[PDB]
């Protein structure tokens, strides 16, 4: 599986039959059908004392990796019910700037999307929590093209020594706090992981207000390669999944 022609999102459902399940991810959120919640608590973002260890370069994105074996970086509220744990961040983007989310907004494409990944801490580990309806917690932030987030930066430049699949990079000491918008606003639905096996035990929170990024901070991003080192130069580009049917599914605003 990749993001290829041969390989893409429209081919998974062959060795991942879950596919084209009943709660999928990536969805479009139309606002004028989402419910306002006013049961729904705010959310609650510890992450300042967050363990970053290293950068690597998975042939389908840059994972940053954070040690989670303690509760260092946790989200709690909203929707949720206990504790879960950061255990990595991922994004997704596409080759221009008119695309690269999963998730859209009335239809609407962000240049990027950001994935923070968060386990359920009563399973134990990630391994058993992704077997959970409620296992994982993943926080979606949409990029858009315009002034630099200074947060970002550390990402950016570490990007050069990770350029082929396999490779990878210490990156300890970096803040996720860097990454957030100032609104905490958000809209929640019950999907599936963003990427094969497709498992369906995410508890979606997707931010409804955009972080910034300037143009060449996203250009880097687009100078990766899905492809390991000594073969063929395949840009890394154009890493997302298309719109999922909600299939009955509600989604619930917190404003
Ligand atoms: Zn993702």
Same mark, same amino acid.
């Given at each position: 599986?990749?993001?290829?022609?041969?390989?893409?999102?429209?081919?998974?459902?062959?060795?991942?039959?879950?596919?084209?399940?009943?709660?999928?991810?990536?969805?479009?959120?139309?606002?004028?059908?989402?419910?306002?919640?006013?049961?729904?608590?705010p959310?609650?973002?510890?992450?300042?004392?967050a363990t970053?260890?290293?950068?690597?370069?998975?042939?389908?994105?840059?994972?940053?990796?954070? =040690?989670?074996?303690?509760?260092?970086?946790? %989200?709690?509220?909203? @929707? &949720?019910?206990?504790?879960?744990?950061? +255990?990595?961040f991922?994004?997704?983007?596409?080759?221009?700037?008119g695309?690269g989310?999963?998730?859209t907004?009335?239809?609407?494409?962000y240049?990027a999307?950001?994935?923070?990944?968060?386990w359920?801490?009563?399973?134990?580990?990630?391994?058993?929590?992704?077997?959970?309806?409620?296992?994982?917690?993943?926080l979606?932030?949409?990029?858009?093209?315009?002034?630099?987030?200074?947060?970002?930066?550390k990402?950016?430049?570490?990007?050069?020594?990770i350029?082929?699949?396999?490779?990878?990079?210490?990156?300890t000491?970096?803040?996720?706090?860097?990454?957030?918008?100032?609104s905490? =606003?958000?809209?929640?639905?019950?999907?599936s %992981?963003?990427?094969? @096996? &497709?498992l369906?035990?995410?508890?979606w +929170?997707?931010?409804?207000?955009?972080?910034?990024?300037?143009?060449?901070?996203?250009?880097?991003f687009?100078?990766?390669?899905?492809?390991?080192?000594?073969?063929?130069?395949?840009?890394?580009?154009?890493?997302?999944?298309?719109?999922?049917?909600?299939?009955?599914?509600?989604?619930?605003?917190?404003?």
């Amino acid at each position: 599986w990749g993001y290829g022609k041969h390989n893409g999102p429209e081919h998974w459902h062959k060795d991942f039959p879950i596919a084209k399940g009943e709660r999928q991810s990536p969805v479009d959120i139309d606002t004028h059908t989402a419910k306002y919640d006013p049961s729904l608590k705010p959310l609650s973002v510890s992450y300042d004392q967050a363990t970053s260890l290293r950068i690597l370069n998975n042939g389908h994105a840059f994972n940053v990796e954070f =040690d989670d074996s303690q509760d260092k970086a946790v %989200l709690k509220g909203g @929707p &949720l019910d206990g504790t879960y744990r950061l +255990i990595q961040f991922h994004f997704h983007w596409g080759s221009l700037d008119g695309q690269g989310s999963e998730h859209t907004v009335d239809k609407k494409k962000y240049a990027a999307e950001l994935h923070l990944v968060h386990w359920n801490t009563k399973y134990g580990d990630f391994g058993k929590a992704v077997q959970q309806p409620d296992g994982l917690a993943v926080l979606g932030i949409f990029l858009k093209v315009g002034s630099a987030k200074p947060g970002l930066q550390k990402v950016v430049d570490v990007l050069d020594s990770i350029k082929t699949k396999g490779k990878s990079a210490d990156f300890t000491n970096f803040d996720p706090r860097g990454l957030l918008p100032e609104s905490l =606003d958000y809209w929640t639905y019950p999907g599936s %992981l963003c990427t094969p @096996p &497709l498992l369906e035990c995410v508890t979606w +929170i997707v931010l409804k207000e955009p972080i910034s990024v300037s143009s060449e901070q996203v250009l880097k991003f687009r100078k990766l390669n899905f492809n390991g080192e000594g073969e063929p130069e395949e840009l890394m580009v154009d890493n997302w999944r298309p719109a999922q049917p909600l299939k009955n599914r509600q989604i619930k605003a917190s404003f």
